């Protein structure tokens, strides 16, 4: 099963700032932009990039070529794929990371279905109980 479309506020732009120091622990700067003008920022772990990652792969098979469309329709089967986790990210590394995360998640917007706008991807910009 997929997620379902919401017929309320959907992103046209999403990008990752930067990342920052919080308590020891890592936080990144997830932005986005709306067609009304609208912006919201969230920190969330890095972890839940990956549980979002897991569930797209299933969510949209077709994107991740898992099947063949009818014959007539044609559109690129791309799918946001992780670089893999790291036990000892050094300083280099941290920087990459905030960077693909940048391209992953703008990704969804500038992808050919509704994916952008998809349940699952918009979870995440926005703000949890907070």
Not at 11 to 17: I, T
Not at 33 to 42: A, F, H, I, P, V
């Amino acid at each position: 099963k997929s997620a379902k479309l919401v017929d309320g506020e959907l992103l046209v732009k999403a990008s990752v700032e930067s990342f920052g120091l919080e308590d020891e622990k890592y936080w990144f700067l997830v932005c986005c932009e709306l067609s009304n003008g609208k912006t919201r920022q969230l920190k969330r772990y890095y972890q839940d990039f990956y549980d979002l990652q897991v569930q797209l792969l299933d969510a949209f098979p077709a994107e991740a070529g898992k099947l063949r469309d009818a014959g007539g329709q044609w559109s690129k089967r791309i799918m946001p794929y992780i670089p893999g986790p790291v036990p000892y990210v050094t300083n280099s590394i941290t920087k990459k990371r905030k960077e693909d995360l940048n391209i992953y998640v703008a990704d969804l917007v500038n992808l050919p279905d509704y994916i952008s706008r998809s349940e699952m991807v918009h979870s995440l910009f926005v703000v949890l109980n907070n």
